[PDB]
Amino acid sequence: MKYQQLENLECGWKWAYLIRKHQEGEPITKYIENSAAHAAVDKLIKLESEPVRVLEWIEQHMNPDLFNRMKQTIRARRKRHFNAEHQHTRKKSIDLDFPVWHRLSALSQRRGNTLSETIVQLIEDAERKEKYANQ
Amino acid sequence: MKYQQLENLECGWKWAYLIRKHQEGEPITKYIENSAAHAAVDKLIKLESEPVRVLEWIEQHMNPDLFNRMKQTIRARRKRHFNAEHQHTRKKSIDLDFPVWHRLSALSQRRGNTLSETIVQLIEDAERKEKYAN
Amino acid sequence: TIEERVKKIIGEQLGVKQEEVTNNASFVEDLGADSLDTVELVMALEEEFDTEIPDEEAEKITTVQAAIDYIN
Amino acid sequence: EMENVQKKLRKLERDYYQIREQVVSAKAGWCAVMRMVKDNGVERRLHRRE
Amino acid sequence: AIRVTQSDRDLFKHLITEATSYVSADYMRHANERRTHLDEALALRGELFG
DNA sequence: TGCCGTTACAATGTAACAGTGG
DNA sequence: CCACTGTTACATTGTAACGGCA
Numbered sequence: 374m375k376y377q378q379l380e381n382l383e384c385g386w387k388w389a390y391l392i393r394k395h396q397e398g399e400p401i402t403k404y405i406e407n408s409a410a411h412a413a414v415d416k417l418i419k420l421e422s423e424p425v426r427v428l429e430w431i432e433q434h435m436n437p438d439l440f441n442r443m444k445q446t447i448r449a450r451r452k453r454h455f456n457a458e459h460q461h462t463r464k465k466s467i468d469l470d471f472p473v474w475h476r477l478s479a480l481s482q483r484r485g486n487t488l489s490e491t492i493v494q495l496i497e498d499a500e501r502k503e504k505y506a507n508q
Numbered sequence: 509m510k511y512q513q514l515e516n517l518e519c520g521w522k523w524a525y526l527i528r529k530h531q532e533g534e535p536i537t538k539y540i541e542n543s544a545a546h547a548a549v550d551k552l553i554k555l556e557s558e559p560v561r562v563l564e565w566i567e568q569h570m571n572p573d574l575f576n577r578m579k580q581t582i583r584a585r586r587k588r589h590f591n592a593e594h595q596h597t598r599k600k601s602i603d604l605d606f607p608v609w610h611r612l613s614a615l616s617q618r619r620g621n622t623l624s625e626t627i628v629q630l631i632e633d634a635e636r637k638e639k640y641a642n
Numbered sequence: 643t644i645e646e647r648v649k650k651i652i653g654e655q656l657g658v659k660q661e662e663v664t665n666n667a668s669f670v671e672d673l674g675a676d677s678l679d680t681v682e683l684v685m686a687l688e689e690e691f692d693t694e695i696p697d698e699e700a701e702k703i704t705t706v707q708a709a710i711d712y713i714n
Numbered sequence: 715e716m717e718n719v720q721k722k723l724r725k726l727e728r729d730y731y732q733i734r735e736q737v738v739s740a741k742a743g744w745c746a747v748m749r750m751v752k753d754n755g756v757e758r759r760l761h762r763r764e
Numbered sequence: 765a766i767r768v769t770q771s772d773r774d775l776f777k778h779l780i781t782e783a784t785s786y787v788s789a790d791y792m793r794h795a796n797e798r799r800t801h802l803d804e805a806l807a808l809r810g811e812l813f814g
Numbered sequence: 815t816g817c818c819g820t821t822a823c824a825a826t827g828t829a830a831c832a833g834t835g836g
Numbered sequence: 837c838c839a840c841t842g843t844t845a846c847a848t849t850g851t852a853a854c855g856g857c858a
């Protein structure tokens with residue numbers, strides 16, 4: 374375990390995830406009947422200010438499909454929240470044109486390293502040329 | 509004007525965007541009184557499946573400060589919709605660690621190029637160095 | 643400008659009023675910045691103008707006027 | 715050989731820049747917070763040294 | 765009157781204590797890591813200069 | 815100027831891979 | 837083995853800032 378797990382934070386994250394999914398129209402409930410699903414969703418809504426009971430609501434009415442996506446999303450959210458403290462641990466999102474990204478991904482898969490590592494090697498070769506030009 | 513604008517598509521886009529903003533809590537309407545705002549939002553909600561009247565709805569009750577944001581959101585939506593047809597025109601999104609991004613942006617700002625152009629030039633130089641050595 | 647970027651840095655690194663920070667306002671006695679506070683002030687001044695300063699020449703700076711004099 | 719050494723020097727320089735920027739940002743935020751708590755909630759209520 | 769005043773007192777007490785608990789903890793944390801990062805940065809600076 | 819393409823981000827969600835310990 | 841976690845590489849949508857052009 375590298376990141377401390379906080380119950381009252383992950384529970385709120387989970388509740389927000391469930392509510393967002395529902396309002397997007399997806400069937401978070403495991404119930405096919407309309408009435409039971411509506412009742413379970415209403416109870417979840419009542420559970421807004423009690424994140425602790427949200428784990429139990431999950432164990433009672435959460436759709437079996439969503440365990441993997443749930444455990445993925447909250448894990449990623451935890452990582453991002455703990456990395457956001459310092460700039461040097463943050464991530465920056467950029468968009469690349471298809472030809473450029475194709476060449477870069479082919480090069481990275483060739484060298485067997487992540488995109489950031491490939492960019493590091495590339496920019497380091499360019500900076501080595503610059504350095505030897507400077508000396 | 510590079511991309512032709514289609515009413516039955518952009519109007520659906522606008523309706524979806526406004527419904528999303530309202531669901532997010534953004535004040536869609538210019539009416540501070542809650543009753544008029546709710547009435548206008550209900551009109552919009554029941555206004556689904558209508559371009560020629562959602563446009564008028566926007567003209568009449570839309571919040572003044574959201575016009576620019578909606579316009580640029582629709583611009584981006586149009587561009588992405590037209591570019592998503594072909595592979596070469598699509599755009600690939602990646603995440604870069606902050607130091608690497610900082611250095612890359614430093615280079616790009618220094619040379620006046622974009623991120624794509626800067627990386628293309630650098631890769632071409634790397635290939636040229638390989639050929640020099642080889 | 644530099645002569646007001648210096649005030650921006652000093653005020654937002656020591657929390658003192660813009661009015662308080664005059665040219666002759668010494669950090670320790672006027673602005674109250676102590677050892678670590680002055681260290682952070684000099685570090686921020688370095689960061690603002692993306693330059694570096696020697697240890698002795700930096701520690702010699704103990705006033706707004708001296709700060710600008712070394713900056714400009 | 716000197717350029718090879720200057721490479722490590724530049725690496726250390728980048729590390730020092732990163733640390734300095736982090737510390738400067740932290741100090742600026744702390745000062746802003748102190749100036750926002752001029753409402754007298756900080757003398758003991760916020761600063762619980764325990 | 766007794767019920768209302770007791771409820772008000774309990775609410776005030778709970779709110780104040782919980783708010784102080786919530787805030788001062790993170791405030792002291794940020795202070796401690798700021799001190800630690802400054803201590804770390806000085807050594808890097810010293811080595812870099814030479 | 816106001817529209818319109820374009821870029822560079824931010825925030826969140828997912829799939830896939832690699833590790834770690836029970 | 838098995839589960840749970842950390843990480844990378846995307847996608848998806850929204851926004852602000854430039855710069856071209858009528």
Ligand SMILES: *P(=O)(O)OCC(C)(C)[C@@H](O)C(=O)NCCC(=O)NCCS
Nearest residue numbers: 676677678681697806807808809810811
């Ligand atoms: P303040 O009274 O807490 O003093 C802080 C300090 C001036 C001692 C500190 O900021 C400092 O300068 N430490 C390093 C001193 C030095 O010159 N060391 C050599 C390089 S590590």
